[PDB]
Amino acid sequence: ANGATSFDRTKKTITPMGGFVHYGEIKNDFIMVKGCIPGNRKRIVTLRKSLYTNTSRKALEEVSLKWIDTASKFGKGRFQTPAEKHAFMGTLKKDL
Amino acid sequence: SGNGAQGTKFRISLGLPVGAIMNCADNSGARNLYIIAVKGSGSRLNRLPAASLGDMVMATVKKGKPELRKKVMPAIVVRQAKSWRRRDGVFLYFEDNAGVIANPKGEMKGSAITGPVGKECADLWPRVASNSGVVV
Amino acid sequence: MKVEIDSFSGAKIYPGRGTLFVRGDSKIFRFQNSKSASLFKQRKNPRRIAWTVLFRKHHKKGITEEVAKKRSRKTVKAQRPITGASLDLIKERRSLKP
Amino acid sequence: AGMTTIVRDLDRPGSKFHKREVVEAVTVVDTPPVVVVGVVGYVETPRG
Amino acid sequence: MKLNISYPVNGSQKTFEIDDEHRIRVFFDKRIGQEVDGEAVGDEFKGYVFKISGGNDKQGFPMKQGVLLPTRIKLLLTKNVSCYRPRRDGERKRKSVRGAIVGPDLAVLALVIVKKGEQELEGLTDTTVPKRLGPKRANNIRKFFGLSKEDDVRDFVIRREVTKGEKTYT
RNA sequence: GUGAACAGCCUCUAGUUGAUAGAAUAAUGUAGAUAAGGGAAGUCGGCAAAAUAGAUCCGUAACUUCGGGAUAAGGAUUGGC
RNA sequence: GCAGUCAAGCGUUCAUAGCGACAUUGCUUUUUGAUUCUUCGAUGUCGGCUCUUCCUAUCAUACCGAAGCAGAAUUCGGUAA
RNA sequence: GAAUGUUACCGCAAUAGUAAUUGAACUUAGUACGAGAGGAACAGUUCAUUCGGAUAAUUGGUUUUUGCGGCUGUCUGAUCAGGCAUUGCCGCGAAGCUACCAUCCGCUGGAUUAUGGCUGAACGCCUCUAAGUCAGAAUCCAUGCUAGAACGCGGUGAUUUC
RNA sequence: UGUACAACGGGGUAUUGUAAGCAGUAGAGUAGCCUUGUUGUUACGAUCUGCUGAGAUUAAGCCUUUGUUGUCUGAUUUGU
RNA sequence: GAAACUGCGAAUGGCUCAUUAAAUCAGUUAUCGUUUAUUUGAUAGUUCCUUUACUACAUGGUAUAACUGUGGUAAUUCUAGA
Ligand SMILES: CN1C(=O)N[C@H]2[C@@H]3NC(=O)c4ccc(Br)n4[C@@H]3C[C@]21O
Ligand SMILES: [Mg+2]
Ligand SMILES: [Mg+2]
Ligand SMILES: [Mg+2]
Ligand SMILES: [Mg+2]
Ligand SMILES: [Mg+2]
Ligand SMILES: [Mg+2]
Ligand SMILES: [Mg+2]
Ligand SMILES: [Mg+2]
Ligand SMILES: [Mg+2]
Ligand SMILES: [Mg+2]
Ligand SMILES: [Mg+2]
Ligand SMILES: [Mg+2]
Ligand SMILES: [Mg+2]
Ligand SMILES: [Mg+2]
Ligand SMILES: [Mg+2]
Ligand SMILES: [Mg+2]
Ligand SMILES: [Mg+2]
Ligand SMILES: [Mg+2]
Ligand SMILES: [Mg+2]
Ligand SMILES: [Mg+2]
Ligand SMILES: [Mg+2]
Ligand SMILES: [Mg+2]
Ligand SMILES: [Mg+2]
Ligand SMILES: [Mg+2]
Ligand SMILES: [Mg+2]
């Protein structure tokens, strides 16, 4: 329940359906960073402490996540959990 | 924007470069608005000044009451066509391009506004809020 | 955080996903993606498109166990006589006869 | 690893979007514990 | 949101306001006619099973059974239907209605007890309000008391005492 | 065979399979294409490109040397069985 | 084309806040001339598009000083490309 | 990319380059000032322009995924399944590439200029200046950022037997 | 010579939008025989329906893997 | 006798002269070509079941306003749950 939150509550990791495209499943501790970072997926990346203390009011804002999208990134993603997908479509030809 | 428009405006995708013609949504008699400029725009070599929903433009009237024609007057874009995106993360677009003729203060000309209106236009311009039944 | 649903397909539209269309009659149409969005603009009729919710509904597809029996009911069998009627004289008045 | 979307309520008193939800792009970086295999010292020199 | 709850056995009704959206969130995406297990509403309601009978959203608009939707739509109304009282003969009016699917927009949810929990509720299973009126017509008296029409109804009609000054009447 | 057709597209007969080759698929090109919103604001200039198009029916202005203008313009229609 | 010095005058009064006659000293080389040194066994010879860099005699943006600067607006000047 | 033993890892930083810009609204304030008409700015806040460096969650664009479906003509006796028409045509189309058509990010110290000052003689007075000195700008030098001198450099690992 | 690598197969993800085959009292209808009909029968009919959100494709720069098969010492060159 | 149900009325009135040129309208016809609340006058022994162990006729059925009580909305001759 990495991707779960106070508001979300459903137990799920951050890994999108069918995993991150081109990467994998994220089975360990991670950083989530607002917005986009330089470099591409799978690349070695350094996260460094800031060189200055910033006030700015735009920083310092303590934020709590509401909901994180766990849907598939390998297509037009619809469902979040594999449960929610069986929930909505129901029983299929293979299944039970 | 910038004159008599109370509050500020978050950036919205530009659907109307100069020369675009949009429907006129009020009862002033004006059928359409030909955009000759955009208030409070920028400058870059060869860039076309563009207008977005909520902006104030200078325009003319191509079809309309001949007393509205051959003259330049300010107007406010009430509806886009080009899909724009609000902070709440939605990508939305109207059916037609439309705006109403307005005095520099940002007060209307006619008393009514036919069709829906963007909130970004509404929040920004008080008088528009008055005459607009359907917001967004 | 409202998860919306598509006005064509019927699938849930989670935040940020898809697109929104304000028709001239000021009726709103939300799509989960370009597929429904186009198909809507193509004047396709969803009850004719096999994968829409409308379709499977109208054609009655996969509703089986939602058509079965259910138990929801209650039991009371009480006595709370007419007001101001002295319900102390309203008990011994009814054991009936027969 | 890649990216995803997040929704949170915004606290920015004065902003039109104060107290209202905003969807936001993010990235994720897989960061399993690094391990310390050595330490090097450095001295100041007129050269550097 | 506020809850307007009613015990159809006693005739008792009390309101409860519930903050903390998670607790509220049990009712979401739920229709009118579906039942709720009250463990999740709180621990005071544990073991009580509820019924969603209606309610009013913000702006107070009523719900309507059957409309589905978690929204507010406009409908043409006629005689003998909910949320419309006609002011003229064959008068119809197109009015706004709120959907029957519960949503966070609702200011008040109308609830009807089905079964009783393990804890007595302060104003409900505790107090009971007697029916306003007793039988009027012939056999209804007979069939309230099961009289097997012989027994002479006029004895079995219910009487209401009232005091006029120092003179009490029946 | 399709169709109005010696058009275009596909085949029978006959004749070919000749034009250095291999591996890749950067920039730039040459040739074929697509682009949200706007719509000539580009430019000497709509250069280019795009739009139109068959047939049946309906409808068709100025003006004219009465012969025209004229497919004027503007419309609806088209499969299969 | 641009900037000086003298200060009769303009500026209600007051030469020089801001201007400035008669004169006079200069700078500049995106004006035009004047000349004809260089290229006539050829340095592609309008304009635009485009891209870079440089100049400051600064239109704007930074900080100042002055006023016939109350405020607002504006004008003169400095450091400034 | 030869050669400064070989090979590998981690670093230093000469020198060179450098970057951010401009506006508006709220508030200050119908305040200061003014007879009035009119009417500011400093701090605080929210956005915006031009610029730059990324980036593809989302949305849009692209389609030889020739992925799926549809359609015309013809050819394989028919069916199934297919071929040919310079990618035959059409709808949808993942992946990638990509867009102020999408989203994110764009640092803070010092020394100065003009200028306004302190102290202060020359010149018993007076003077920001002569000696000495304070404050100071979109400037400057750093910080930061990008290269890394292939003839600038440091630390560390392993260093061959037929 | 091992949470080794590879080629397939499985599962997830994703795209299209309901496969072939078979069946039906679906179907504007149409023929042929007689026992000339108190659903008379054998068939044929664009299309519809059910099995069937099926079938197909899915890494070629998707995710994954207790299954299967196979691979794991050729060449050159370097010294203070 | 409030309220409310029920029944009736709200289609008369009053106003205006916009359209309307064989339309309206006028006089004169027609319904053996139709509908008509009301008023007025006439008009109804028949209703059940293979027809002795029999059907409530000394009269069969609930479901609602008003009311009570819990509610929503800035807001109306709004109204919801019980
Ligand atoms: C381009 N050229 C060319 O072909 N010959 C040269 C000529 N030299 C000149 O003196 C002259 C006078 C007028 C002109 Br034009 N030019 C020409 C310039 C030049 O370089
Ligand atoms: Mg991905
Ligand atoms: Mg994706
Ligand atoms: Mg230009
Ligand atoms: Mg004209
Ligand atoms: Mg109004
Ligand atoms: Mg598309
Ligand atoms: Mg797309
Ligand atoms: Mg050749
Ligand atoms: Mg060739
Ligand atoms: Mg070749
Ligand atoms: Mg190319
Ligand atoms: Mg295309
Ligand atoms: Mg275009
Ligand atoms: Mg156009
Ligand atoms: Mg034009
Ligand atoms: Mg032009
Ligand atoms: Mg021209
Ligand atoms: Mg043209
Ligand atoms: Mg051309
Ligand atoms: Mg086109
Ligand atoms: Mg012509
Ligand atoms: Mg036809
Ligand atoms: Mg003189
Ligand atoms: Mg003076
Ligand atoms: Mg004078």
Ligand SMILES: [Mg+2]
């Ligand atoms: Mg000049």
Ligand SMILES: [Mg+2]
């Ligand atoms: Mg001359």
Ligand SMILES: [Mg+2]
């Ligand atoms: Mg010369």
Ligand SMILES: [Mg+2]
């Ligand atoms: Mg020469």
Ligand SMILES: [Mg+2]
């Ligand atoms: Mg020459």
Ligand SMILES: [Mg+2]
């Ligand atoms: Mg030459």
Ligand SMILES: [Mg+2]
């Ligand atoms: Mg040359």
Ligand SMILES: [Mg+2]
């Ligand atoms: Mg030449």
Ligand SMILES: [Mg+2]
């Ligand atoms: Mg260029």
Ligand SMILES: [Mg+2]
């Ligand atoms: Mg003075």
Ligand SMILES: [Mg+2]
């Ligand atoms: Mg100065």
Ligand SMILES: [Mg+2]
């Ligand atoms: Mg420069």
Ligand SMILES: [Mg+2]
């Ligand atoms: Mg310089």
Ligand SMILES: [Mg+2]
């Ligand atoms: Mg050697």
Ligand SMILES: [Mg+2]
């Ligand atoms: Mg104010």
Ligand SMILES: [Mg+2]
């Ligand atoms: Mg004054």
